[PDB]
Amino acid sequence: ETLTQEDCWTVISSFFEETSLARQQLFSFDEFVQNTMQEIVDDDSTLTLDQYAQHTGAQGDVTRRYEINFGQIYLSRPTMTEADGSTTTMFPQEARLRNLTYSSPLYVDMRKKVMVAADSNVPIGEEEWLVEEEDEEPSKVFIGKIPIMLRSTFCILNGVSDSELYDLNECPYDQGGYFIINGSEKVIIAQERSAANIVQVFKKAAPSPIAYVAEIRSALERGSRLISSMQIKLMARNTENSGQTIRATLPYIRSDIPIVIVFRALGVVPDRDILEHICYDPNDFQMLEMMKPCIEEAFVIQDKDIALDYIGKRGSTTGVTREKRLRYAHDILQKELLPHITTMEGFETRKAFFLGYMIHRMLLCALERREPDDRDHFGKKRLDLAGPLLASLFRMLFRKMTRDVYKYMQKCVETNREFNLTLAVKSNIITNGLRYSLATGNWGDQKRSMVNRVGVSQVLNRYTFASTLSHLRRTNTPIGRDGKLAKPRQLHNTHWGMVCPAETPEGQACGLVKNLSLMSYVSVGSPSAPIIEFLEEWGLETLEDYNPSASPNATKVFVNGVWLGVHRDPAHLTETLRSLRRRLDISAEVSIVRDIREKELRLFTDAGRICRPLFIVDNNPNSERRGELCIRKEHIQQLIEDKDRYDIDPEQRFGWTALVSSGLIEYLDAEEEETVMIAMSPEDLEASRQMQAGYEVKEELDPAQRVKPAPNPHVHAWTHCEIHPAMILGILASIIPFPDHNQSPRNTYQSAMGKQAMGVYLTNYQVRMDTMANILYYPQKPLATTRSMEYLKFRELPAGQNAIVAILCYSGYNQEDSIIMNQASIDRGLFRSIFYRTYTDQEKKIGMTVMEEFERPVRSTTLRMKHGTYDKLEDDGLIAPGTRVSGEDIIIGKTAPIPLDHEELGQRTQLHAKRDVSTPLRSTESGIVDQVMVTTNQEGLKFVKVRMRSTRIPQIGDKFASRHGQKGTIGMTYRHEDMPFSAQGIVPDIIINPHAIPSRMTVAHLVECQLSKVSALSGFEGDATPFTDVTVEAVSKLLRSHGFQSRGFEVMYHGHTGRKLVAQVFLGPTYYQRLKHLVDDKIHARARGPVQILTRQPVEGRSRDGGLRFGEMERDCQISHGCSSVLRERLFDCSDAYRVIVCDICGLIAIASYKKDSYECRSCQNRTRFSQVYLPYAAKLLFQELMSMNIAPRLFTKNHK
Amino acid sequence: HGINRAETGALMRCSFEETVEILMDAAASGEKDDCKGISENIMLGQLAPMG
Amino acid sequence: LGATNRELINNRAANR
Amino acid sequence: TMIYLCADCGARNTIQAKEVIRCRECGHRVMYKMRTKRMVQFEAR
Amino acid sequence: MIIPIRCFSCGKVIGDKWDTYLTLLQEDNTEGEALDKLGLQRYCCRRMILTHVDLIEKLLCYNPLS
């Protein structure tokens, strides 16, 4: 009656049956579209304009009020309207092919209203509005187009079966979770931020004048979701002042207000009240002693009105009357102070209570009673997914659209023109803004590009199925990528189960870019009202009636960072809340953290909290199953039975949700993990349980197995248990076999290199015209596989091959991380691949005249024709599929008319009227035209895409890698006869050097080879899942059972001499990957060619025939060598040699005519004394740039002593 | 702070972290450069007088 | 929604 | 003149000079060119 | 894609055994037993039947026609 690992994997299988790997993106977007858009519309629902009566002296002057109310929003399915005006439903593949944004139009119900003031003599603002005119029904008005995330509930592919996906040219394996903007796929990278409504106390480092700072980043639940931030700074002890003063930094205040003054502005004038707010214990004298100096500092202000005046004088406005200053101070104190607590009248008591709480926390850290906060604790951070981000963007864009509508109202009213609702809205605002933000990633308005966030949207990575899965689950921390702050980059303890420990890029973004674990769930947010209602009805004492003195031992209750009140029995409250969540009466995303030392009960329901699921251990006092998992074997058998059953209703099967709603699985975030005790496996629970039942928990232990620490006797109750430790890994770390037998940076290196492995990325790559694609001819699934691969679908779309690898020193061509590849194996298709590239062109147009034509250009009329071949183009200016092209051969023929007024030296004969703008093939590439797609673009102009294919056979210089960070290039290829063989005639496909193994300590590579050999011999698949009881001893026994040396060695013979090698070789199958780094993609040589126009130096880039940079370090190396002429050649004769004539009198470049051999300096009237200077063109450019700043850099060739 | 304080040629120092400021100072003081260093000769494309 | 999506996909020729 | 294939039908469409790219049994606005008439030879190594 | 004609290492023709391999599997034969019945003794020749993934069938589902 103990849970097994097979049962754990059945539970995980159910999880992934009901959960997609793109679930976070999809659910966030669904939340944004279904709910957040309506809330954003409502928050700015009404627009009102009051036309007062100007005193023009004409009888008939009456004030008017015009009102526009924005109603419900309607989102249709994505559609396209053509040039001819026909409107059709649009499908993702057509959008990808024709470069169309896959967006759905949005309509909003607007209603208009006009009212007349009852009397015009009333003071402004007191006019009574009588209903004059009103729209009987609303007008459904198109306001914009929202890009639709693929596979979301509003996509055309939602609820669509596999067969219909094929009919649409869609891969059933594709998970969606992205957008199509102008044909390109864009994924929104989750953005990490610090949580709002949390008080964080930070110790400022010396010699900063501030000792400690308590900061809260207050955000309204839905009212723009984050505006105000406050600080409470304690100032450092000074030799002049015997005490430290507490000053509150508030929005829109130029100075730090002493805390007592802001308390008085809140009505807590008496000192006793203030120190009861701050120091809840009268008997504690250190707190009051530290508060005394600020009371001393703030005695000059003893009343609320004087405190408000003090605040107002320090507002951003100077030279204002006292009444306005007091009004402004009260307005700031009400609205811009702690808006998450409240923003409405009569709530100064709660804000004062929370301010006292913040001061108490900061002084607890200043007394060194509690440690400061950890800025990097994962439970204090939130992930903004597509939902929240698109919500902020749409709020901004809808505000801009409403401003436009209001300006339209004002302009129409001024001119007495009739107001039309349809003409009022500039629908281009929302459409263009969303399109621009999703396309460029620059997050915000086009006009605030520098201040906007960047890189929020990235082109989806279609190199391998696993790389795409990884890209859909990527988080970015917007820390400075140049500043060297190792702490944010480090792997925190709280990352356990939330972020992948291994998968993180190497380089500047190491540790900042993170990847969600397999079972990590990111909350989308839920209402806090039901939870507050349950708290109120269960005995929550409101904060208005709370008196700390009466109940100092009672526990503060927070919800979303709002101190709602105080409870007297927080244990029972917490058990009741947890029970409710365990029935889903409360949302499963709700964090219920009881902090016993701090006497707090924090509830969280907001979005962005990363959670992970865990088993629940039965802890009920009267239960007969103390210390045993709630989930029985019966529940597992139910999962197996309902997995296959399809006759059952799809929504009424027993699966993952049935476990959560039944109280057998619980989602915990990092905040709640701090209050739980988690067993690492059911066997650990059991061992602890016998240890606690008096049994010795002792037995004969397989010496080959991992050694675990003995069960801790100090642990008597476990609250949870992990479903499987292997779930702490990401997409790519879950493809590594035996990752727990490797040195961790090798796991990171494999996680990075698995993205670049060649395979089949989508099944529909044939019908997709991608810019770049690399496809493996004969992909094979690994012989050694992890159980997590079933959910990553690596067996379905693998990205490598099982090569027979021998670890041997054979001819010395595999040294320094090179490999030797069998040439016969290459000839038979090993690691062969296809490279597809796509060239896009289209017809342009300006005004009413088309200035481009897809045609076969003719030498006799087209000016400036390229040097490539125009003979492979067909009559329609294009190139047919199946033809062979190379280098600069033209694949698309396009011409542009020239203005009739242009006269280019007569080179443009009377026949020459056009100019060639054709598209040549890349100079460094050649192949066969695979495909030529022809269509029309959004503007009804012709639009062509030419896909070329080119087979790449492995050769010397091509990167290959194992799944263990073992990367190399091919150094040499030997044929079948020349390679070492076994007594069966097995010849390895690859030979790798032994020296790669010891230093790197990639023992997982050797264990993989042995296990793959066993599985190839026996046919059973090899389980390489981490943290299993699969030992090398068991694999050795299995291998010996097949008539092989147990450790994987084989007697091999020399191919050259047939002699039996003195050493026995480690030979067996290992999964290798062809990497996107091919030598021919990189080989580059330049003799001469293009130069930059400005500097006249070799251009940059292999693709554009550019030179290589001779940098500062190379110059230093040649200096230390002493090779003066080498430097002169590299930096002058080979880059930008140039000649000028300087005047020997003034030292400035002269006017030189070499044709006439006449030189002149008008300034000096010099025509005889000149010098010839050889210098870099960049030097002459620098000198001219200086002369443009009135600096005269003068070159004198003779010592002017 | 230390390298640019040295009384070396103007071009040699402007090649290090204070380019326009150093050039402006040299212009303001009417400064003269001997072209006896490495950076100056390399910039002017002449055979460096060293090695 | 699934049925509507199926209807829209299958008749894309007729609805065009 | 030039014949293209309806990306849905695969039906041969004889588009002419400056005509909307559309399928006449399938309304599809994406079509493909046809395999060239040139000789295609590949060595089997 | 489709099963390779010959093995990568041994050069043995395996392209005429994929159908036989699948048929053997349908008859309640383990993959090891089926490979034994196919006379694939070298594990290099066995790995390619064992680890082959048939993407040709999935690529044939995107037929422009029905």
Added chain:
Amino acid sequence: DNEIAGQPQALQKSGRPLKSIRARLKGKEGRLRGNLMGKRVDFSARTVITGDPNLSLDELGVPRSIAKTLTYPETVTPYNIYQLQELVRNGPDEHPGAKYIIRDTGERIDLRYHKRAGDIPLRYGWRVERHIRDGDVVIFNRQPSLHKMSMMGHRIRVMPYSTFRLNLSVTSPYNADFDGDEMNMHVPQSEETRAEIQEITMVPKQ
């Protein structure tokens, strides 16, 4: 100077700060660090490196394609006129051959586009840009160039395949290995530079 403190920047019509003269002269990419103390150079190849146990310590194995691209401008004299004539006869496409002939007046004959390239008698004082051949001297380096020993002289061996092949014991001064490293090759274009590379910079001397 558009980076003045306390002033509004002169923005672009595309919402970008203007490129002031100070910005052109300033920075790593400025004139004095991106165009004067460092440059893009002609007659340089780059590619992946593999190992060759059969190469001499001072030899660099160069791909045929790179050898065909890069050329050395050898001056025609009574001592080489015959071999230079043979190289001109071979043409730019047959290695070892030649690509250009530079006359006394400076005019540049392109042997590919000259209809009768092979039938051109050579005259003393001309130059022939002949393919770099086995035994030619080149500078070879890897980045970052942390010390003198990261740019060393090598003798060419033009050979098949697309990688730079070099002796194993030379990896250490370059800090190079064959897991994907790419290295650069610079071809000296004068007798003086050749003498310097051969007499100071060569691998055995290092």
Added chain:
Amino acid sequence: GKAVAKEDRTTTPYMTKYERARILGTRALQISMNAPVLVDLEGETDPLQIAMKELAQKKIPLLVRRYLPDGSYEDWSVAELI
């Protein structure tokens, strides 16, 4: 700049490695431009090898003008240098 007398010369009497590289390069460059060769040729075609064999016989007609830091200089014949 004042030329130092042959007897007063204080610099090293050996050819420096930099001097050797510069001398060989300069002589090879001059030979490539048809400078008369001052040594018997056994069929050598590379100007650098011709300059090397001229050096071995001390037949390079070149001087080294070694400059002292103050500006005074010493002229050393390639033949007399060791």
Added chain:
Amino acid sequence: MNQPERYELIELMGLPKVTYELDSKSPNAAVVTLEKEDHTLANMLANQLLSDERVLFAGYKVPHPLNHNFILRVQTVEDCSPKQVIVDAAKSLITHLEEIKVNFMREWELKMISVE
């Protein structure tokens, strides 16, 4: 792109199949260069030569795997020549292979008759 054509492993392109030169450094020593040949011929030829008493030295090398050829250095006693010992070893190997062939064919015929 820089691949060599595989037919270059079998085509001489005008090179001589066998080159024979006298090693001047040593007496009665010769170097035989065989183009488009590899360890198949060289190994057996050198082993057969070393079965011979008149052969003081017999070794072979393949200077580079990217060139298909091999060098064979043979030194004999003063009373014989390297060329004669090489030819005698080659003739002996031809005869040996001929018995291998004949006996294989006879045994194969016997075994097949046994099958029937």
Added chain:
Amino acid sequence: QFSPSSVPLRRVEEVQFGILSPEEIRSMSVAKIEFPETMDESGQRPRVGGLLDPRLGTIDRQFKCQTCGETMADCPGHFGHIELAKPVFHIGFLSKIKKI
């Protein structure tokens, strides 16, 4: 190599930094720049006196600079001048001006 010149080739031994005087700027200039335009009404040629004055240098491979008559590969580019309405501070020199 470059086109032949009778002026002897010399090494630069002195970079004398200074400030261009107003008279130096006026005299060393070849065209007074007054018009903000680059192109002209006719369009076939830039504006004479604008910001692409042919006397100010050639950037078209077609034509030869009027100032020197040389191709785009031998014309270094000449300097114009703008007569300011009233003097303005040189931002690079502001601190030195203040100190003086």
Added chain:
Amino acid sequence: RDKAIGATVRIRRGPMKGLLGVIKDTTDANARVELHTGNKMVTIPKENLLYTTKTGELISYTEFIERSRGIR
């Protein structure tokens, strides 16, 4: 302007006999030819190439010149 450039050709004699290609460039002696297979690119003497005509025939080099001259 050579008339051979752009003409489909097969290799008559040599190790690469029987391979199809298109003459990208042509010197007086040899033609630089773009083979259809393996992205290969070769230089082959004009005399070593059969030329493909409009009717599918293969003709010799001298036949090609005699056809191009147009004398009849």
Added chain:
Amino acid sequence: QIVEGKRIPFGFKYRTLPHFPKDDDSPESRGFIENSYLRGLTPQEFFFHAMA
């Protein structure tokens, strides 16, 4: 396993992972891997080694 020169830090409150109790200074809690690469790391050891 050593992070910033010290044993694995208490990133939770007085524990390194939610699998140990508070104030556990034992070798296993703070990042001592008694296993070898051959034998395999336990999940806690795997995480600590990943941190290093």
Added chain:
RNA sequence: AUCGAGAGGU
């Protein structure tokens, strides 16, 4: 072409 952003390589 220019500019900006991003993904990568050693």
